[PDB]
C-alpha cells in the first residue's frame, strides 16, 4: 500500500535546467527521464490538446530500503490555465529539499488538491481501463464498493456502504452496450435507478476497488508499482476550471 | 473427481442443472402418457354408460 | 528488479485465483434455493 | 436433591460491586426497599419496624447524602452481606429505572411441523418444573416480577458455582409476553445460556415437543420498543408508511356522523412529476415548500401529522443490511446495502429533506416498511434472512 500526495503547479516550469546543480545541495546523484506519449481522449481521433510531457526521478542509492523510497512524477500541458501538477509518495526529507530548491527558483506556489463527487467516481474508470502493446483497449474489472458518511444531527445515519459484485458489473455494462465510460451508463445511474439515491449529491468518502486502488478525497492510495497516465490526465481536467 | 476447487464448483452447478432438466423432461413425458391413458379410459366409459 | 517483477506477477496471479473461487461460489449460492 | 437455594442464602458478593448497584438508584427508592427488606428477613438493627422507619425518615429530613445511607445499609444494617432476594430486587428496580441499557433478542416457539405455539405461562407451575429441571445439574435460584406498565413477565435466572460460599454468575433474563409465540431473552453464549433456554422449552410445553427458533440475529435494546416491534400489537406487520392502518384514525365508525366523513371535505394534494426533473435544477413557493416537506413525512412516518424532534421515528433501529437482486438480460444483478447509525430510517428522512435523495423513487423497504428485518428482495417481494 503506497499513499500518494497530490499537488499542483501555478505556471509551467522547466525541470531539466541544472540536474548538475540539483545534486551538490543533496550530495548524491539523481537521474532524469524525458517522456511523452499519446493520451486518446476519443478513440476515433485526437487533437493537439492531449500533448502531454512527463518527468520522473528519484532520490536514493539503497534498493534494499524499500521503505525509504520516493518518486516525484510530473505531467501536464502548456496551453490551458493550470499547466501541470505533481504527485509523490512517502515521508522523508528528500520529499521536500528539491521542493524548496524550486520554491525560490521559479516563483510557483503550491496548494493542496481538492476532490469532490464530480471527480472522485471517474478516477476508477481510468484505473480499471487497460492498454496493450498493440493499442487495443480492454477493461479489467473489479468489485467496487462505495463509502458514504453523511453529516447529520443525533448521528442517526453516520455511515453506510454500497457493494457491487463485479460479475453484476459485467451484467450492467453489457446491458447498456459497449461503453468507454462504464460508470456513466451502467453503475452510477443504476443505483439511482433502483434505490433512488443520488451518489453525487450525497457526501462520498471513499471508492474502493478489489485490491487494485484505494480512492479517498484526502489522498489516493494504490498498490501498483507506479501510477498510470489516464489517471493523471483526468485529474488534470478535473482541477482545471 | 477434480483437483481445482473452481472446477469442483462449476461441475456441481452443471450437475444441479442437469438433474433439474432431466426431472422436468421425465415429468413432461409421463404427463403425456397420463393424458393418453385418461383419454382412453374416458372414451371407453362413454360407450359403457351409453 | 527481475525478482520484483516476478513477485508482482505472482501476486497478480494469486489475486486472480482468489477472486475466481469467490465468483464460482457466488454463482453456486445463486443456484441454491435457500 | 437439596441443591436449590432458599431466599436466605448469603453469597460472598463483593462490597464494591453492590456499592455501584445502589449508586444508580435514586434516593426515594432506597427508602422504600429498606422498609420492605426488614419486614421480610429483618436485619442487624437493634430495633423494631417503628424505630427503623423513624430514623430512616430523619435521614430524609436532614437531606442526608446517599453515600451515607448506602454505607449505612451495607456496613450497619447488613454488614455481613446481601441476600439473593435483595440482589434480585435491586436488579429489577435498576431494570425499571433504566430500560434503555439492556438488550434483548427475539425467539419463536413452534409445535409440530410449522404451527406456532402461543405461550400460556402459569406464575406458579413454571417455577417448580424449572427448578426440578435445573437443580439436577446446578444450583438454581429464580425470581419473577411483572412490568408495571407492560404486559410482559420478566424472569431472571441466576446460576451458582462451587469452586464454601457459592459464586454468582451473570443472570439470564427471559421476558414472556402474555399471549404471543415470540419470546424475548437476553444475550448470552456461555454454558448457562444453552442450559437455561433449553430447560424453559421443556418446562413450558408439558405435553408436546417445543423448539425455539431465533427470529433475528441483531439484538435491540429498550424492552418497551421491542414489544411494539415484535410483540402482540397492532403495529406489527404494518410499520413504515402503513402505520396509519395500525391506528384506525383516518376512518370513522359507520354509526358516526357522515358530514365529518372526509369524502365531502376531500384532501389537499400536489402533482408529482413522472418525468425525471430531479437531476437538473428558481426558488420554491412557501406553500410548495410546505407540501414538498409533507411528502417526505408521509412516506417515512405514515401520516402528515406523524404517528409519533420531528425526525425521530416510532422505533429506532441500529443496523439493517438489505440485498437487492434483479434479473436483467437473463442474468442476476446483485446490490448489497448496509446501514449503521442510531435511527436509520430517521436519518434517511433528513437526507430527503435536503433534496439529496429523490422521494418518489425510494422503495418501500428503504422507507421503513418491515423494519428491523434485513433480507434479500426479489420481484418486489421481501424475504427475511434465514
Curated annotation (Swiss-Prot), chain A:
Protein name: Inner kinetochore subunit IML3
Keywords carried by this UniProt record: Cell cycle, Cell division, Centromere, Chromosome, Kinetochore, Meiosis, Mitosis, Nucleus
Subcellular location: Nucleus; Chromosome, Centromere, Kinetochore
Further details from the record: Present with 125 molecules/cell in log phase SD medium.
Family to which the UniProt record says this protein belongs: Belongs to the CENP-L/IML3 family.
Quaternary structure annotation from Swiss-Prot or TrEMBL: Forms a heterodimer with IML3. CHL4-IML3 is part of a larger constitutive centromere-associated network (CCAN) (also known as central kinetochore CTF19 complex in yeast), which is composed of at least AME1, CHL4, CNN1, CTF3, CTF19, IML3, MCM16, MCM21, MCM22, MHF1, MHF2, MIF2, NKP1, NKP2, OKP1 and WIP1. Interacts with CHL4 and CTF19.
Signal sequence range: none
Biological role: Component of the kinetochore, a multiprotein complex that assembles on centromeric DNA and attaches chromosomes to spindle microtubules, mediating chromosome segregation and sister chromatid segregation during meiosis and mitosis. Component of the inner kinetochore constitutive centromere-associated network (CCAN), which serves as a structural platform for outer kinetochore assembly.
Lineage: Eukaryota, Fungi, Dikarya, Ascomycota, Saccharomycotina
GO cellular component, one term: outer kinetochore
From Swiss-Prot, chain B:
Cellular compartment(s): Nucleus; Mitochondrion; Chromosome, Centromere
Taxon lineage: Eukaryota, Fungi, Dikarya, Ascomycota, Saccharomycotina
Name of the featured protein: Centromere-binding protein 1
Gene responsible for this protein: CBF1
Domain of life, source organism: Eukaryota
Further comment: Present with 6890 molecules/cell in log phase SD medium.
Subunit structure: Binds DNA as a dimer. Associates with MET4 to form a heteromeric complex which also includes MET28.
Function text: Required for chromosome stability and methionine prototrophy. It is involved in chromosomal segregation. Binds to a highly conserved DNA sequence (5'-RTCACRTG-3'), called CDEI, found in centromeres and in several promoters. DNA-binding activity is enhanced by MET28. Required as an auxiliary factor for transcriptional activation of sulfur metabolism together with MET4 and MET28.
UniProtKB/Swiss-Prot annotation, chain C:
Transmembrane segments: none
The organism's place on the tree of life at top rank: Eukaryota
Compartments (UniProt record): Nucleus; Mitochondrion; Chromosome, Centromere
bHLH domain: residues covered: 5-34
Note: Present with 6890 molecules/cell in log phase SD medium.
Subunit structure: Binds DNA as a dimer. Associates with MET4 to form a heteromeric complex which also includes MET28.
Role this protein plays: Required for chromosome stability and methionine prototrophy. It is involved in chromosomal segregation. Binds to a highly conserved DNA sequence (5'-RTCACRTG-3'), called CDEI, found in centromeres and in several promoters. DNA-binding activity is enhanced by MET28. Required as an auxiliary factor for transcriptional activation of sulfur metabolism together with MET4 and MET28.
Protein name: Centromere-binding protein 1
Originating species: Saccharomyces cerevisiae (strain ATCC 204508 / S288c)
Lineage: Eukaryota, Fungi, Dikarya, Ascomycota, Saccharomycotina
Gene name of the record: CBF1
From Swiss-Prot, chain D:
BP terms from Gene Ontology: attachment of spindle microtubules to kinetochore; cell division; CENP-A containing chromatin assembly; chromosome segregation; establishment of meiotic sister chromatid cohesion; establishment of mitotic sister chromatid cohesion; kinetochore assembly; maintenance of meiotic sister chromatid cohesion
Gene: CHL4
Protein's UniProt name: Inner kinetochore subunit CHL4
Cellular component annotations (GO), alphabetically ordered: kinetochore; nucleus; outer kinetochore
Functional note: Component of the kinetochore, a multiprotein complex that assembles on centromeric DNA and attaches chromosomes to spindle microtubules, mediating chromosome segregation and sister chromatid segregation during meiosis and mitosis. Component of the inner kinetochore constitutive centromere-associated network (CCAN), which serves as a structural platform for outer kinetochore assembly.
More info: Present with 606 molecules/cell in log phase SD medium.
UniProt xrefs under Pfam families: CENP-N
Molecular function terms, GO-annotated: structural molecule activity
Similarity annotation: Belongs to the CENP-N/CHL4 family.
UniProt superkingdom: Eukaryota
Compartments, record wording: Nucleus; Chromosome, Centromere, Kinetochore
Keyword entries, A-Z: Cell cycle, Cell division, Centromere, Chromosome, Kinetochore, Meiosis, Mitosis, Nucleus
Amino acid at each position: 500500500p503506497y499513499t500518494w500526495k497530490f499537488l499542483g503547479i501555478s505556471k509551467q516550469l522547466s525541470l531539466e535546467n541544472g540536474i548538475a546543480k540539483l545534486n551538490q545541495l543533496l550530495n548524491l546523484e539523481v537521474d532524469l527521464d524525458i517522456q511523452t506519449i499519446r493520451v486518446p481522449s476519443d478513440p476515433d481521433g485526437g487533437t493537439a490538446a492531449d500533448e502531454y510531457i512527463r518527468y520522473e526521478m528519484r532520490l536514493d542509492i539503497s534498493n534494499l530500503d524499500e521503505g525509504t523510497y520516493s518518486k516525484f512524477i510530473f505531467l501536464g500541458n502548456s496551453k490551458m490555465e493550470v499547466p501541470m501538477f505533481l504527485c509523490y509518495c512517502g515521508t522523508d526529507n528528500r520529499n521536500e529539499v528539491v521542493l524548496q530548491w524550486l520554491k525560490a527558483e521559479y516563483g510557483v506556489i503550491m496548494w493542496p488538491i481538492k476532490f469532490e463527487q464530480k471527480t472522485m467516481i471517474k478516477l476508477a474508470d481510468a484505473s480499471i481501463v487497460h492498454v496493450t502493446k498493440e493499442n487495443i483497449e480492454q477493461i479489467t474489472w473489479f468489485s467496487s464498493k462505495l463509502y458514504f458518511e453523511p453529516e447529520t444531527q443525533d448521528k442517526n445515519l453516520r455511515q453506510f456502504s454500497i457493494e457491487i459484485p463485479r460479475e453484476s458489473c459485467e451484467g450492467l455494462a453489457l446491458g447498456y452496450g459497449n461503453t468507454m465510460h462504464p460508470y456513466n451508463d451502467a453503475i452510477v445511474p443504476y443505483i439511482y435507478n433502483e434505490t433512488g439515491m443520488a451518489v453525487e449529491r450525497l457526501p462520498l468518502t471513499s471508492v474502493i476497488l478489489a485490491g487494485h486502488t484505494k480512492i479517498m478525497r484526502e489522498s489516493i492510495v494504490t498498490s501498483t508499482r507506479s501510477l498510470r497516465n489516464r489517471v493523471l490526465a483526468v485529474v488534470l481536467q478535473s482541477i482545471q476550471f | 473427481r477434480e483437483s481445482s476447487k473452481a472446477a469442483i464448483l462449476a461441475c456441481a452447478a452443471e450437475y444441479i442443472q442437469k438433474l433439474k432438466e432431466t426431472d422436468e423432461a421425465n415429468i413432461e413425458k409421463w404427463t403425456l402418457q397420463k393424458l393418453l391413458s385418461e383419454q382412453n379410459a374416458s372414451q371407453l366409459a362413454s360407450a359403457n354408460e351409453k | 528488479e527481475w525478482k520484483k517483477q516476478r513477485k508482482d506477477s505472482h501476486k497478480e496471479v494469486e489475486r486472480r485465483r482468489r477472486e475466481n473461487i469467490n465468483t464460482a461460489i457466488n454463482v453456486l449460492s445463486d443456484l441454491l434455493p435457500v | 436433591n437439596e441443591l436449590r437455594l432458599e431466599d436466605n442464602y448469603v453469597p460472598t458478593s463483593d462490597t464494591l460491586v453492590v456499592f455501584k448497584q445502589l449508586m444508580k438508584l435514586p434516593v426515594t427508592v432506597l427508602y422504600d426497599l429498606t422498609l420492605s427488606w426488614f419486614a421480610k428477613f429483618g436485619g442487624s438493627f437493634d430495633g423494631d419496624i417503628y424505630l427503623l422507619t423513624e430514623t430512616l425518615d430523619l435521614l430524609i429530613e436532614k437531606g442526608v447524602r446517599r453515600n451515607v445511607i448506602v454505607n449505612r445499609i451495607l456496613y450497619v444494617y447488613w454488614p455481613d452481606g446481601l441476600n439473593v432476594f435483595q440482589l434480585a430486587e435491586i436488579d429489577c428496580h435498576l431494570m425499571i429505572s433504566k430500560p434503555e441499557k439492556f438488550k434483548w433478542l427475539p425467539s419463536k416457539a413452534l409445535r409440530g411441523d410449522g404451527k406456532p405455539y402461543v405461550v400460556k405461562l402459569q406464575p406458579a407451575k413454571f417455577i417448580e418444573n424449572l427448578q426440578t429441571d435445573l437443580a439436577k445439574i446446578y444450583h438454581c435460584h429464580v425470581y419473577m416480577f411483572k412490568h408495571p406498565s407492560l404486559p410482559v413477565l420478566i424472569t431472571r435466572i441466576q446460576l451458582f458455582d462451587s469452586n464454601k460460599p457459592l459464586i454468582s454468575r451473570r443472570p439470564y433474563y427471559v421476558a414472556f409476553p402474555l399471549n404471543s409465540p415470540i419470546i424475548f431473552h437476553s444475550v448470552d453464549k456461555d454454558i448457562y445460556a444453552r442450559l437455561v433456554l433449553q430447560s424453559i422449552s421443556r418446562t413450558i410445553s408439558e405435553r408436546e415437543t417445543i423448539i425455539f427458533k431465533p427470529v433475528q440475529k441483531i439484538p435491540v435494546k429498550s424492552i418497551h420498543n421491542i414489544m411494539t416491534l415484535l410483540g402482540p400489537s397492532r403495529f406489527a406487520e404494518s410499520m413504515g408508511p402503513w402505520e396509519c392502518y395500525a391506528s384506525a384514525n383516518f376512518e370513522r365508525s359507520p354509526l358516526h356522523d357522515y358530514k365529518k366523513h372526509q369524502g365531502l371535505t376531500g384532501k389537499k394534494v400536489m402533482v408529482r412529476e413522472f418525468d425525471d426533473s430531479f437531476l437538473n435544477d428558481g426558488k420554491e413557493e412557501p406553500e410548495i415548500r410546505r407540501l414538498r416537506l409533507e411528502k417526505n413525512m408521509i412516506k417515512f412516518k405514515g401520516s402528515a401529522n406523524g404517528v409519533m424532534s420531528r425526525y425521530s421515528s416510532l422505533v429506532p433501529i441500529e443496523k439493517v443490511g438489505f440485498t437487492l437482486k434483479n434479473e436483467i438480460n437473463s442474468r442476476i444483478i446483485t446490490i448489497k446495502l448496509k446501514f449503521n447509525g442510531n435511527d436509520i430510517f430517521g436519518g434517511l428522512h433528513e437526507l430527503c429533506d435536503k433534496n439529496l435523495i429523490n422521494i418518489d423513487k425510494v422503495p418501500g423497504w428503504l422507507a421503513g416498511e418491515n423494519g428491523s428485518f434485513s433480507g434479500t428482495i426479489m420481484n418486489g417481494d421481501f424475504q427475511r434472512e434465514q
